[PDB]
Design brief:
Number of strands of chain A: 0
Chains A, B: Capsid protein VP1
Helix content of chain A: under 10%
Organism of A, B: Bombyx mori cypovirus 1
Structural class of chain A: little secondary structure
Oligomer: part of a larger assembly
Keywords: viral ATPase, histidine-mediated guanylyl transfer, conformational changes, regulation of transcription, virus
Entry title: Atomic model of transcribing cytoplasmic polyhedrosis virus
Largest interface: A-B, 6 and 4 residues
PDB class: virus
Chain lengths: ~50, ~50
């Protein structure tokens, strides 16, 4: 009683940090896989998705 | 009869009407712009000729 929202997220215990994945923001995000070239320093981030 | 232009004839003349700025015209602030170079170099369209 008192639960406010119940979501169905990708499972952190299986998609672990060992696999590179970062589920904290509600989407998977891996750091230096498909980086765009020729763009400004903060502009890589969407590729992390 | 209309006045003969002073350069048209050989007499010297020491009273003449010079046009002038009322005050120095370099007094103002210099122009400055906000250049903002393109987001992605690969996306630039150099085509169209």
């Amino acid at each position: 009683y008192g639960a406010a929202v119940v979501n169905i997220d990708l499972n952190r215990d299986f998609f672990d940090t060992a696999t590179g994945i970062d589920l904290t923001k509600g989407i998977p995000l891996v750091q230096d896989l498909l980086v765009p070239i020729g763009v400004t320093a903060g502009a890589e981030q969407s590729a992390e998705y | 009869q209309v006045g003969i232009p002073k350069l048209e004839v050989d007499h010297i003349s020491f009273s003449n009407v010079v046009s002038m700025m009322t005050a120095n015209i370099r007094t103002g602030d210099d122009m400055a712009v906000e250049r903002v170079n393109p987001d992605d170099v690969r996306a630039i369209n150099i085509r169209n000729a």
